[PDB]
Amino acid sequence: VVGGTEAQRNSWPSQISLQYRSGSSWAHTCGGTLIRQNWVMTAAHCVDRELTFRVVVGEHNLNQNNGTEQYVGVQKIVVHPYWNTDDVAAGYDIALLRLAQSVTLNSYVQLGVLPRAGTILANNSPCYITGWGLTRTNGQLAQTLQQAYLPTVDYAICSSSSYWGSTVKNSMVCAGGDGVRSGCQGDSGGPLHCLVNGQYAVHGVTSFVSRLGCNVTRKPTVFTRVSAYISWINNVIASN
Numbered sequence: 001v002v003g004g005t006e007a008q009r010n011s012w013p014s015q016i017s018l019q020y021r022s023g024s025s026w027a028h029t030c031g032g033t034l035i036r037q038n039w040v041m042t043a044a045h046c047v048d049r050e051l052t053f054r055v056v057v058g059e060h061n062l063n064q065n066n067g068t069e070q071y072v073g074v075q076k077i078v079v080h081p082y083w084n085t086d087d088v089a090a091g092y093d094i095a096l097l098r099l100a101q102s103v104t105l106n107s108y109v110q111l112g113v114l115p116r117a118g119t120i121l122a123n124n125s126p127c128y129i130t131g132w133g134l135t136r137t138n139g140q141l142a143q144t145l146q147q148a149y150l151p152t153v154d155y156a157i158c159s160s161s162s163y164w165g166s167t168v169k170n171s172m173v174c175a176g177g178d179g180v181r182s183g184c185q186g187d188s189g190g191p192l193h194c195l196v197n198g199q200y201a202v203h204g205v206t207s208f209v210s211r212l213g214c215n216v217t218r219k220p221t222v223f224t225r226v227s228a229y230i231s232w233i234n235n236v237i238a239s240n
């Protein structure tokens, strides 16, 4: 997250860190959202490569033991069947990971609230992006979880020629673009928490930003719109 600030200790309890084994150690690669004790929601492009993954819940500082973490392996990976690694712009950037074991819910670990199917947010709706991603274009990962206010940009404005044009589809959500704050590499797969009726719900899964950079004016971070996949998500967790 570029232009963000350190989130309070475990203040976004559904946020997870997706990591892969690098020889004899582990490295953070993407974010994700705990939606069931044994299911995590993330981006399909985070799990396209055949590596060994593990999920860390209750995480805050990636480089030190905070005494709140739970480390668990990944048993099954279910990518949306229409996902195309070579066309992220085509959408369908979403995947569900069945964990090898159910984590224990507590003060630091809780389930993320999903929106009702078909829910679209009004322009400039209040949302926050969280993640351990790059704190600057071509920079380095954040050691502690970061957060940044990132209001939405409706489809009409976001799909116009002044912003993303036709690269963005209605199955996506745009947020940010103030040229200062945004998602960045490493935040992918993470949540976009939006305030709806007094409650924070995960309306997006971080998908992509501009090739030119992370924080680019009129180039909002683009997220997979969760509300468009509710039926898919339920069908997966009901038959797996």
Ligand SMILES: [Ca+2]
Pocket: 059, 060, 061, 062, 063, 064, 065, 066, 067, 069
């Ligand atoms: Ca830690």
